[PDB]
């Protein structure tokens, strides 16, 4: 049974929550981005409507089969009427084609559910700036102050630099990155483009690829291995063996790989800036994990939060055990004390 956290109170709607079979009263699904712990359940049977961003929609299509009448696509920063109640998808800087959504009730409340989100200074100018927030359904994935990770700009030019020194010095190392979702296109994008390759890669990850709406994509990616000094690989496969294994693949063409595992947080950002980081190397095969993270950190959080004033908050995430749950709930009253709200 669908949770209460996935219900908007007050209107037909939900957030999220396709893997509970027919919910009772909902008349139409939200779905706020295209990563499977949130479409779960979805597929060409599903016969409700569903509203979603034009690139989610994309996807539900093509990679999904959903049928094109049960697919509503809506325009970001633009108030549109949904089953007679007001709403505005927002950019939520997380994975291409993400959205946070602004419901508008009847009864005046205003709620704000930010799907999965990197926060960012730059949301308090978009269509929030106008008006009061009573209730904030919020990612917190990262709701604790041991939550530090870089810039996505400085972790890009860690892995541009880093690459590029690398081939230069030998321009018979292949590169290879790691991928198990959309998100991150920006890591394997910007080394492809310092390198001047296409990158290279599956014909299902091409697919998926193809239904981002991203500028000029068909002049950065190819299912020709062989044209391709980039390849793109099932994160599983970024590990020494199966590295080795493809280095065979690839018929003598390279003597080195060099690849990159983008996480997000791990415990060595506890220690180590972004400069410092180095691989794990083994004969002529090194692997680099880069902190590149699509969800807001602790203080990123905080700052939005202290921002936007909400009444009251509703966790969407770490919400299974208690002791999170106490942790968070302490979070948001110290925040809420200091900023006097
Ligand atoms: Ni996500």
């Given at each position: ?101 602004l ?7 205003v709620i704000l ?15 929030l700036?106008?008006q009061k927030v009573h209730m904030l ?171 936007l004033?909400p ?31």
């Open positions: 049974t669908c949770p209460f956290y996935k219900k908007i109170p007050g209107t037909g709607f939900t957030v999220d929550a396709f893997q509970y079979g027919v919910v009772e009263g909902c008349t139409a699904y939200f779905l706020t981005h295209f990563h499977s712990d949130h479409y779960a359940g979805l597929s060409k049977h599903f016969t409700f409507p569903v509203y979603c961003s034009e690139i989610t929609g994309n996807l539900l299509k093509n990679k999904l089969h959903v049928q094109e009448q049960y697919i509503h696509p809506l325009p970001l920063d633009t108030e549109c009427i949904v089953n007679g109640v007001k709403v505005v998808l927002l950019d939520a800087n997380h994975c291409p084609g993400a959205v946070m959504i419901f508008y009730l009847p009864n005046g409340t559910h930010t799907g999965d989100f990197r926060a960012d200074p730059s949301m308090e100018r978009s269509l700036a106008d359904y919020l990612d917190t994935t990262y709701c604790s102050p041991e939550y530090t990770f870089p810039s996505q700009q400085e972790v890009i030019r860690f892995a541009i630099n880093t690459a590029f020194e690398a081939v230069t010095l030998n321009p018979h190392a292949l590169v290879v990155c790691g991928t198990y979702s959309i998100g991150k296109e920006k890591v394997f994008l910007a080394i492809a483009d310092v390198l001047g390759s296409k990158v290279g890669m599956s014909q299902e990850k091409y697919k998926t690829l193809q239904c981002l709406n991203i500028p000029e994509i068909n002049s950065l990616i190819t299912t020709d291995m062989c044209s391709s000094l980039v390849h793109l690989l099932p994160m599983m496969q970024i590990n020494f063996k199966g590295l080795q294994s493809h280095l065979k693949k690839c018929g003598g063409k390279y003597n080195q790989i060099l690849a990159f595992r983008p996480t997000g947080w791990t415990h060595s950002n506890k220690f180590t800036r972004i400069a410092d980081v180095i691989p794990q190397t083994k004969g002529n095969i090194s692997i680099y994990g880069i902190p590149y993270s699509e969800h807001s950190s602790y203080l990123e959080m905080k700052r939005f939060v202290q921002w004033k009444q009251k908050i509703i966790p969407t995430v770490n919400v299974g055990t208690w002791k999170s749950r106490s942790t968070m709930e302490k979070y948001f009253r110290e925040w809420k004390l200091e900023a006097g709200y």
